[PDB]
Amino acid sequence: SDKLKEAETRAEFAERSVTKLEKSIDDLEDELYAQKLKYKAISEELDHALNDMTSI
Amino acid sequence: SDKLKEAETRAEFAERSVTKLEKSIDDLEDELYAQKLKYKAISEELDHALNDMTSI
Amino acid sequence: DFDDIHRKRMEKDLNELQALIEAHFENRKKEEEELVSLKDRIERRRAERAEQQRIRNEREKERQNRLAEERARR
């Protein structure tokens, strides 16, 4: 019984850790992807600016 | 016996998974920071350009 | 002339525009400094999580190996 109680508690703690880590990963992923899209957009508008310079 | 075997086994899986998750988290965060720093270097390139544009 | 006042107007336009340009330069620069400090404390967090995770795993492997040798001895 003692071993069972300790094991169950350790398991539940680790499980909740797992869930929270997943949520953190998701949020950081969303922010990083938004930054990535921002970077692609800035580079593309930069190139458009370069081509505008080429025009004039 | 069945219960505690199950619990310890799934807990070990949990520990290995969560450690893999932590490696994933660190790699993602560091890559995010590297990309963000590249972006800020680009922003300061643009800010030097804006200081030139202070010509207007 | 009209060209003179037009020139002064586009002039003050350039002045205010370059002013705001340097201004948002400074603002985004502060934001980048804050984000850099964020990345730094982030790497601090990575290192601390790594060391504490490794300590946990050390104790875990010690326990598991002790139990394993107890099993093998039995």
UniProtKB/Swiss-Prot annotation, chains A, B:
The modification Phosphotyrosine is found at Y33. Transmembrane segments: none annotated. The modification Phosphoserine is found at S24, S43, S55. It is found in: Cytoplasm, Cytoskeleton. It comes from the Eukaryota. Induction: Induced in stimulated quiescent cells. Phosphorylated at Ser-55 by DAPK1 in response to oxidative stress and this phosphorylation enhances stress fiber formation in endothelial cells. Binds to actin filaments in muscle and non-muscle cells. Plays a central role, in association with the troponin complex, in the calcium dependent regulation of vertebrate striated muscle contraction. Smooth muscle contraction is regulated by interaction with caldesmon. In non-muscle cells is implicated in stabilizing cytoskeleton actin filaments. The molecule is in a coiled coil structure that is formed by 2 polypeptide chains. The sequence exhibits a prominent seven-residues periodicity. Homodimer. Heterodimer of an alpha (TPM1, TPM3 or TPM4) and a beta (TPM2) chain. Interacts with HRG (via the HRR domain); the interaction contributes to the antiangiogenic properties of the histidine/proline-rich region (HRR) of HRG. Interacts (via N-terminus) with LMOD2 (via N-terminus) and TMOD1 (via N-terminus). The sequences of cardiac and skeletal muscles are identical. Belongs to the tropomyosin family. This is Tropomyosin alpha-1 chain. It comes from Mus musculus (Mouse). The chain holds residues 229 to 284 of 284 of the full protein.
